[PDB]
mmCIF file of C-alpha atoms in Angstrom:
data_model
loop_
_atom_site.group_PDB
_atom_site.id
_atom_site.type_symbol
_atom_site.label_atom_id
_atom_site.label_comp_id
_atom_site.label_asym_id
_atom_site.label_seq_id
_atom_site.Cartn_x
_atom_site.Cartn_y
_atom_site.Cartn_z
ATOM 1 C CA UNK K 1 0.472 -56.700 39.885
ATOM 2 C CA UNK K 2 3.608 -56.657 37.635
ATOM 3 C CA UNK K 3 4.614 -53.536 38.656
ATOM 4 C CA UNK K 4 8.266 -52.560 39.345
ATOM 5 C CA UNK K 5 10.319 -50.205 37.512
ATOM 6 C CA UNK K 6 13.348 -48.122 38.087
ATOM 7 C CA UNK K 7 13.843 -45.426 35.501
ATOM 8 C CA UNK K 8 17.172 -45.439 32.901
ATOM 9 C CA UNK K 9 17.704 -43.035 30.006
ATOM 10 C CA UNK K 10 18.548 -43.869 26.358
ATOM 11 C CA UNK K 11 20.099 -41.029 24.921
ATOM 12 C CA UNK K 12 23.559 -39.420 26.013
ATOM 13 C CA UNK K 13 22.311 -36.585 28.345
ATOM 14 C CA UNK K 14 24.867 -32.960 28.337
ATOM 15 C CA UNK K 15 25.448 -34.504 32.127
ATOM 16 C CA UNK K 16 29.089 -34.579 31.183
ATOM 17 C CA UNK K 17 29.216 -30.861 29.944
ATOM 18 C CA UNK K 18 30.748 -28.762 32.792
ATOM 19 C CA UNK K 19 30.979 -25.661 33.571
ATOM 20 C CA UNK K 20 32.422 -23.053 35.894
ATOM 21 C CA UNK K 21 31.180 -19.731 36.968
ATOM 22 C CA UNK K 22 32.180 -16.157 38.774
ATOM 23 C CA UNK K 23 35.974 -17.951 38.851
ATOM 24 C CA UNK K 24 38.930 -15.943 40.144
ATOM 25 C CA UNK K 25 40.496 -12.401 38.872
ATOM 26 C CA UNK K 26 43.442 -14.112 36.814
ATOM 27 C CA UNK K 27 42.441 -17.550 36.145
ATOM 28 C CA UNK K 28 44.073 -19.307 33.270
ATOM 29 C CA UNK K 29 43.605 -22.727 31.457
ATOM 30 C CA UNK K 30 46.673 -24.043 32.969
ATOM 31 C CA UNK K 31 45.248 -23.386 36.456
ATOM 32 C CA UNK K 32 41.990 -24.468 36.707
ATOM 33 C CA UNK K 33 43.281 -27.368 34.824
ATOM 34 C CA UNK K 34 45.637 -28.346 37.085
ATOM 35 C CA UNK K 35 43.532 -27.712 40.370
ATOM 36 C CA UNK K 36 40.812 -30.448 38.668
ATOM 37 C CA UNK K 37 43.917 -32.108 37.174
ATOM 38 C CA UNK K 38 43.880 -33.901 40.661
ATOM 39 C CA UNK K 39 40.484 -35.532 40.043
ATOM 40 C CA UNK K 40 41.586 -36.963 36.929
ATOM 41 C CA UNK K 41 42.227 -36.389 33.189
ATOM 42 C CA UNK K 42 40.568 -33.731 31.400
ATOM 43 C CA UNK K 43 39.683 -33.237 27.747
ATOM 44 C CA UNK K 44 40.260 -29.600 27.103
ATOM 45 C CA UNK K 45 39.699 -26.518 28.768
ATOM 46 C CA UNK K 46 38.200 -22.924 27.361
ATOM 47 C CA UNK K 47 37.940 -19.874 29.931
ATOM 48 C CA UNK K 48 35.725 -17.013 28.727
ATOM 49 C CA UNK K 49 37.686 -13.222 28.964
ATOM 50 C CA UNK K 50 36.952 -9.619 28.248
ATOM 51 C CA UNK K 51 37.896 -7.349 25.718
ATOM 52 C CA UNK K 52 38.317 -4.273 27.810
ATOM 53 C CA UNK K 53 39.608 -6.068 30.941
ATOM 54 C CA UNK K 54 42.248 -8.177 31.158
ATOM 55 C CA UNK K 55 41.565 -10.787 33.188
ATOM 56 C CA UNK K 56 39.109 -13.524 33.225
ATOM 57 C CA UNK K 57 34.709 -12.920 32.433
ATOM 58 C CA UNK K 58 33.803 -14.972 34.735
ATOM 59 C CA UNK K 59 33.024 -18.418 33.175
ATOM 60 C CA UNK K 60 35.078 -21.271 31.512
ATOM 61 C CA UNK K 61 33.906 -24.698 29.899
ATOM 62 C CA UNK K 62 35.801 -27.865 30.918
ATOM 63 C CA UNK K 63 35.010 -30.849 29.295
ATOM 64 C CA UNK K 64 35.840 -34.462 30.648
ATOM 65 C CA UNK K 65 36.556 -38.279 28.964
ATOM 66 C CA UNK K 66 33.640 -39.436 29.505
ATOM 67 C CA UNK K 67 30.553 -38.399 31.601
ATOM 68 C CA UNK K 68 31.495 -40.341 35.120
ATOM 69 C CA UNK K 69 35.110 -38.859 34.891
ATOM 70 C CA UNK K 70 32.786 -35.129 35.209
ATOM 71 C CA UNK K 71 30.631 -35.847 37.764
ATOM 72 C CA UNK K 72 33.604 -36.818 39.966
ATOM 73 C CA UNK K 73 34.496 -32.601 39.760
ATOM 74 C CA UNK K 74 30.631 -31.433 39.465
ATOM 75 C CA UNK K 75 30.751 -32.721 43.138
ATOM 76 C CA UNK K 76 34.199 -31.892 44.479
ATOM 77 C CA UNK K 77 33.821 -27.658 42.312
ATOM 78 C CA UNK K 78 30.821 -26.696 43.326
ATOM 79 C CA UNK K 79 31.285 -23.828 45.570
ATOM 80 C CA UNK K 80 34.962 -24.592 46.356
ATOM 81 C CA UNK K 81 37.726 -22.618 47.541
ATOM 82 C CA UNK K 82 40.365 -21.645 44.397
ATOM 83 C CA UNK K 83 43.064 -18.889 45.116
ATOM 84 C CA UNK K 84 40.758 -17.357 47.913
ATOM 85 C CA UNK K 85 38.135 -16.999 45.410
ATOM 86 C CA UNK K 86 35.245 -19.210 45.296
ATOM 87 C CA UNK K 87 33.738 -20.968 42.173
ATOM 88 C CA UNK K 88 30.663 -22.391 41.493
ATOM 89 C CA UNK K 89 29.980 -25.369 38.657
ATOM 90 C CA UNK K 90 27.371 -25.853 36.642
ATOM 91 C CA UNK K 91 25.089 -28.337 34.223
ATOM 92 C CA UNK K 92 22.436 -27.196 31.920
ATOM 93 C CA UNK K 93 20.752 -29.831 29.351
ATOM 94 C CA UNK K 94 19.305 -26.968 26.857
ATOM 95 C CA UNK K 95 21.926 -24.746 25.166
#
């Protein structure tokens, strides 16, 4: 017999990076920051923009505390309604 195992990781996976994509025309730190701001506190927040264009790329990086304090948006952003546009979230490991 003796077998029974679970599975738990060692190392600190990029779980807690997050990040947004195809956001909203004018989207701004201070927005997106406050829409998760309701979830709980945030670290810092980076949205991507243009040089010809001015308004947003397309994609921003938020970063949380800690990794459970991410996954509580990861959930609640994916594919969620922000200023009529939608916005999908995100969570590579390799980048």
């Amino acid at each position: 017999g003796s077998s029974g195992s679970s599975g738990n990781r060692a190392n600190p996976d990029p779980n807690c990076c997050l990040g947004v994509f195809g956001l909203s025309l004018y989207t701004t730190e201070r927005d997106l920051r406050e829409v998760f701001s309701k979830y709980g506190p945030i670290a810092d927040v980076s949205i991507v923009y243009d040089q010809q264009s001015r308004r947003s790329r397309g994609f921003a990086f938020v970063y949380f505390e800690n990794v459970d304090d991410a996954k509580e948006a990861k959930e609640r952003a994916n594919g969620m309604e922000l200023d009529g546009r939608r916005i999908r979230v995100s969570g590579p490991s390799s980048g």
